[model samples]
Target: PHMMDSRDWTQLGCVAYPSPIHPDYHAGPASTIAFDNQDELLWIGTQKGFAGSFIGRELKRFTAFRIHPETDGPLRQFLFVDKGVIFLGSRSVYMAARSGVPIWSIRHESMQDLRAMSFTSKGTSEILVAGWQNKMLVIDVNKGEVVKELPTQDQYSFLKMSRYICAATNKGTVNILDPITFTIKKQWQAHGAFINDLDTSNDFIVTCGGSHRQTHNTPAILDPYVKVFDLKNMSAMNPVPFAPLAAHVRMHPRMLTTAIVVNQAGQIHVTDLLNPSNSQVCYTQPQGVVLHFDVSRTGEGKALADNKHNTYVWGSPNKIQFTE
Candidate 1:
């Protein structure tokens, strides 16, 4: 079954949902959102390090697990692999199943602030973990042990592309690296300031970031431009503009050339990559900070988490189906 329809969902209605049954519901609201590869579950990670894996469009809570004893801060991201679900904790990584079974969990000193990871050239057998201060950690997925460590240029975010790994630095540049050797095959300055977030598609790559500010005591201002680069040609394209400022962005699984851009101001733009001027989008309530956003692999689901600890979803959940 699939969740694709030709009809216009441009003005699709939206409704808010409550947090899953957490061991400590008072920890906080949803902080990160992730969908399994097979689309079997919608996973919501909270500020206190709890994961609520809900089933179906109804969001029935299938299971919930705490990654840390207490709130170590919000779970940064979730990775779904063949072994199970690998999530980064404050100082560790844990493997678990859809049934909420804890397969294996490991802790390392370098992982004090472990952020995110991606599969390397060894396929799912090995992965490269990225985080603050520490060099990249290459771990054996099956053993849950670090096999080797590679030096990095302060890279933090990683995306496993079709042929190579795309890594973004702590600064504002991006690099195309060899998944095996961890060599920088190509690198470029995508922005003048640190990037807030980025996403890669079949043919293109996009970044959400702000430029450097003028003052020394204040914070950098978020820019409204969504910088686009042609992955195929290895060239930059016209940057997409969002007046509200692109808070976070995600690409469509099938559309290939489309993106879901949010300004954090509640302006959601389902913009065309090439011609961004015209878009059929929706607007949510103003003034709340947009913490995280994600698109379903089925391309039928759209969800966002806000500072108010509220999780809002927009789509035809009943019509959405996940293939096992």
Candidate 2:
């Protein structure tokens, strides 16, 4: 069963539902959101190192786990693989079950900001993590050991494709690497500033960041832009002037040619990649910072986490928002 009709948001209405279970519940800053279709669970991660899972059909939260006990920082991202969920923190990586059981956790010395992570199987499964400081950690999760640590050009984010791995660097370049050989196959400059985030599908990749000025005499300024690349040719598409703090390509349930982008002002913009001129604001709340957002796999729901430590889910079965 799906959560809502995938169409224009103007046809629907929204109602706020505050959590009653924990009125003073705060996990620091809500940084990332995810959905587990197999179990119908909505999960949220916070910069305070909290990962909480709640029932998808109700407002009740059933599981909560502390991701980083040593360093209380952002849980950069989460990936639900085969039967386990991987949590990428500011300085470590953790593997845990949906039932809230920890499998293993590893610490990375140079990893102060974990940007992106993905799992792949080459004979056996391996996890790839990319972050700042020109570091990439390849790990064997099952063994809880680091297989290899590769170096990059101070990357801020990365994406794992079926054939190759893409790393977006602080120096404004995208490096395509052989997943197995870890060799750079090709590289190109996709941005002028530090690459903030990267997302990919089977056909396209999306990147966004602000350009930094290099003159010491002048004040620092950022030139924000969004770019789409054709995976087949690795050619740059038309770049947009919208610079968001975070960007994620929505491809599930059906391909809705849209990207959910949130600016530093906490305003969420639903941009049509096919028609960039008519981007709409899907959400606007000024109470707290918009830390993270996620679209459901069934394309029926969207979740957001704010700096207030509150998690919000927007879904509807018909055309109206539902809370039960």
Pairs that collide in candidate 2 are none
Q: Among these predicted structures, which one has the highest TM-score?
A: 1
In Å, residue 288's CA in model 1 sits off its true spot by 3.1
- How high is the CA lDDT of each candidate model? 0.72, 0.62
What's model 1's TM-score?
A: 0.86
* Most lDDT-accurate candidate: 1
Off by over 4 Å in 2: 1-27, 57-59, 108-114, 121-124, 213-225, 241-253, 264-272, 275-281, 284-286, 317-324
lDDT of 2: 0.62
- Scored by Cα lDDT, where does model 1 land? 0.72
lDDT of 2 by residue, 1-324 (tens): 112123543212121222333321443455677776556677776556677777664535667777787354666778776567788887888988888788888886866677777765452368888876677888897787788887766565655654466667667677766777767777767767655566666566667655664678764333455677766676767765565544333433355566666554555566667677876665445356555555667665666655665556665545422221
